[model samples]
Target: EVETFAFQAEIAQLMSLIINTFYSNKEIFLRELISNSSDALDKIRYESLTDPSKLDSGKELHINLIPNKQDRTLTIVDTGIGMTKADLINNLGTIAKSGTKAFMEALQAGADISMIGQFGVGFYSAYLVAEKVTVITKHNDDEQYAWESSAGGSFTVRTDTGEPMGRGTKVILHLKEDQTEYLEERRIKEIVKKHSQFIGYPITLFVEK
Candidate 1:
């Protein structure tokens, strides 16, 4: 029922910035995502007072980083508000903030840091190390869906093929060969502390069954 637009020229330029910038460290990506998930959890906790049914039974404001060495797969699962088919498009297909536009205005007005916050470009950070990515999310308002992308210009969004994991989100990253360092427990935990230590959510390190 809603319409969205693509990233503006400036934001588009920002989109291609992964291979270049030293301004944003690669480690910040997980931090941003975990921060976003924590926000989602806060939203639901507040909403639960009037809508107890909306509380995600399966998720509890935690971040799970799992790795599959043999397959080179890295999964970052979170118990956030999740997303639906529309969300897949609204969240990924198009850049919601048009960060480039704001960024230009901010730069022109010398308010550069302003555009850095609401920027939708954070999620695209997965492109840095992932050859392919699978986002499986279950929203409170609709059926779950999986969105697949190759860090290319486009992505595919559709109903999930795998079994839905209740009301939450699971972002599975098929890691690039060089990104294997992220698969190690010490590495994952180290990054979590550096970024998400006091993030208000219980971050967990799961050993897959």
Candidate 2:
């Protein structure tokens, strides 16, 4: 089953603004995504402290990067707090309603904001380098679901039937033609070292050499 939702007016405007004007350092898209994954990992770890069962058996907390040069896609997989369908819609679909627009307004007023995640608009940075983004996530208490978008006016969410993800989320970026530099191992490694060197969980990149 699938459901499609139009972007809220402000979110639609923010999407266009993010894709067209907001960023000058496009490579920070990697930073934004990795930070989001780290946040998910942190949440799962915190929840597991009290619930114990929240952490899947034998599944270590980490993030994995798999780049498919042949397919021009880069996948970031995290053993983290995966989202339910509603979570996806709420978190990804309606970010503008959650204070990000205020952040943007502040930015427009020349406020020097350094952190992207603080305002919840960081996820949209994926559009800086990708033509499409697909998220497949499985929550411990919810069925797996897939959310997809082209940074357009709408997005779709549906039950996922692909290989079982165990418990976590995978964000697959369909890299734009000019952004294929992200598919390079050295480039990814450089970005990770420069931006996420101190991230708590292990980040593993699958190198095909």
Candidate 3:
């Protein structure tokens, strides 16, 4: 019998541990997710040239951080190969990672999870500050889907009926009060250049009213 398993009691404790013992700085989450989006762009663009059809999806390789002060919202958009429903499920839930599984099992069995960060779940970083997050993704080989989460252990995934985005994804972060600094245009620009300036593509910072 195949059924969905809710977050175990251990996971709830883990969440509390993370919120208390780790991720003290919310900004790091944004940095991690943006870095991940950049990596996704790099991966897709590398494949697009060889395939040719991906060009019709987009003519650029880049990332953009848009902020709207009126709504106290922040958006991190990327033009990269997007994900499908399966991709979302696999990427978000069950830690679809070989190293993660093996390391976790070993650690539970009295071994250490050294180098654990290598098996990264880039998407989960968004939960650090976002009360709710939405991903509008379009893949060349899959239908567009909107994946959303509120860090409440349950997420909603559904196919989105919108214009296909040639071949990339957009990740939007609705900032919490503690994350208001991310909405500052100058600060975001500085961080992007400092960490992702030579990131092999253009990254833009959007300022809104």
Candidate 4:
């Protein structure tokens, strides 16, 4: 079943801040994304330690980056914990952290730019340079599903009939007109080396032969 959810009042404005006000610092989007991927990889690995079958038993834990200049898209795929339909709604719909209203209010009051990082809303930061974003994830206990949004205030989640991945999540970013550098392998690696080199898991880039 497909489900569509709207953002909370404060979160709508939060998107505005991220897409418009914080666009200058957009390079941080890759760092935030790679960080989230690392965290997801950590989560599944941690859970698997206690429960051998907590996830699909065969997939490895790693991250892959695909930069497509033709489509102007960059995809971040991870073999880690994948989100189910409900998880998509819950995680993507709002800032689960408490005091979002206060957070939004502080932003309006000229809070330090660094303060935004403390909110744990890294996922939405994808819109910093993406015109559209698509997420196809497969969790062991759940069917494959895709979540998509344009940061236009709401998002949709539906069954994904596309080729199902072994396990984990794939985030596809359709780059904005001015953000084409992210589509180059060298540039992508530069960003990763600068911000995500310390991530515990292996990070690999996908390139054409």
Candidate 5:
């Protein structure tokens, strides 16, 4: 089920605000992303407690960040409760829950930039520095898929046909010209420590010299 979808009317507007004025400090992008990973991991943990096979039992519950300077990509991979095809549509294609209409309204009403992610608009903040973003995820019950966009209203979703993830998500950010600072391993480690040091799972950074 490969298709292209436009952002919901309200979400399109919210994304405009995010790409233009929402994030005052771009470093927090890591925070929002890692926070999201933690949330997903927690969900799987809770589900497995009852079902015992809700997700992969052998998968490592951790996050790994790998920076590719050659291609100027920063990849964050996590073993968590990955989404299904419908989840991708509902979660990313449209605002099925926790819509950002009110968030946009508040921001227009002079709400602090800090309030952007409060409405669950954190994932799109990758556009703060990325020219293109790709999210590849694998769920326990479905094949892997990739959702890609360029901060534009429209995005495409397709079967990944890539390496299997076993179970989880991998977010790849293609940094924009001005966002190259994110490529420096030292800078990334600093930001991770500042924002996600206390996360429940182990956060590993893979830096190639």
Candidate 6:
């Protein structure tokens, strides 16, 4: 069964701001996505420290970038701690509601907050370049699910059966016409070198001949 949900008020507003005015550099969208993948990789590794069974998926901890010029799409796949169905909704549907609450409390207490923690809005950066975003993820605890949206105030999540994914997340960005440059291998290489060079996991860009 497919389920659709509206973005929270704050998230809907935030999506518009990010897509229309917040980021001056659209290329940073790639940076934000890769960073998110790295974060997931870190989480899986941390968890495996205690429960070694978490690593049974046997996929290496890494990220893969596949750009299809013909389709005008860029897919970022990560072997990491994937999300369950509820996690898809809670993590992607809501935009940092809990973090904002904590932030406000800290402000009222006169605590010095160096940075806003876990704002969870980085995923919206994809909207800066993609007309549509599709996320297919699988968690060890639940079945695979696919989440799709176009920054159109709502998103849908459904059971995914197109391809069998052992464990992890695959994010496919259907690029906007003007953003097709991201589909070039050279362009992706430059972006990764400039923004994600120090990321711990290996980031491979597939070259289609």
Tens digits of per-residue lDDT for model 4 on 1-209? 77887867666776666677644667778887888888889889999999878765445888999988888899999988888777887754545434456566676788743455567776767878898999999888789999988877887889999997878889999999999988877888888999898999889998865
Lowest summed-lDDT stretch of 10 residues in model 6?
111-120
CA-lDDT, candidates in order: 0.67, 0.84, 0.66, 0.80, 0.82, 0.82
Instruction: Estimate TM-scores for all models.
Output: 0.79, 0.92, 0.79, 0.89, 0.92, 0.87
lDDT of 1 by residue, 65-114 (tens): 77788788878777777777776775543554465555545545764331
Candidate 1 vs candidate 5: the TM-score winner is: 5
Can you write out model 2's per-residue Cα lDDT over 55-98, one digit (the tens) per residue? 65335999999999999999999989889877888756565576
Number of the top TM-score candidate: 2
With candidate 5 superimposed using the best TM-score fit, by how many Å does residue 89's alpha carbon deviate from the native?
A: 0.8
TM-score of 2: 0.92
Q: Give candidate 6 regions above 4 Å deviation.
A: 22-24, 91-95, 98-118
Q: Relative to the unseen true structure, what is the C-alpha lDDT of residue 188 in candidate 5, on a scale of 0 to 100? A: 95
- Measured with C-alpha atoms, the lDDT of residue 12 in candidate 5 is 73
Model 5 Cα lDDT, one tens digit per residue, 1-209: 66988877777776676677645588888888898899889988888888887764345799999989899999989899988888888745455235476676776788765555687777877888787899999888888899888857888899998898888889999998888889898999899988888999999999788
Tens-digit per-residue lDDT, 28-65, candidate 6: 78887898899999999999999999989854899999
lDDT of 3 by residue, 1-209 (tens): 11233443333333333344444555556666777788888778788769877767787888878888777778778888877767776654565344345544554676422223345643545666676788888887888888776655555677777766766788777777777887887878777766566676777777575
Which model, 3 or 4, shows the larger TM-score? 4
**Model 4 compared with the native: what TM-score?**
0.89
Looking at model 6, the pairs that clash are none
